[PDB]
Specification:
By secondary structure, the chain is low in regular secondary structure. The chain has one domain (1-40): Zinc finger, CCCH-type (CCCH zinc finger, Irregular), CATH 4.10.1000. It is 0% helix and 0% strand. The protein binds zinc ion. The site of zinc ion has 6 residues, from loops. A zinc finger (C3H1-type) spans 6-34. This is mRNA decay activator protein ZFP36. It is found in: Nucleus; Cytoplasm; Cytoplasmic granule; Cytoplasm, P-body.
Length: 40
């Protein structure tokens, strides 16, 4: 069963290198590629 929602499916890829960080300081997913649940 696990969580019945869970956050997004993205990940701090190149972002973590001070790039963009769609959620600077608050990033957990939404960022560069982030296609865990779309190719992984
Ligand atoms: Zn980030």
């Amino acid at each position: 069963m696990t969580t019945s929602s869970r956050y997004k499916t993205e990940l701090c890829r190149t972002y973590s290198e001070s790039g963009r960080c769609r959620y600077g300081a608050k990033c957990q997913f939404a960022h560069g590629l982030g296609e865990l649940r779309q190719a992984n």
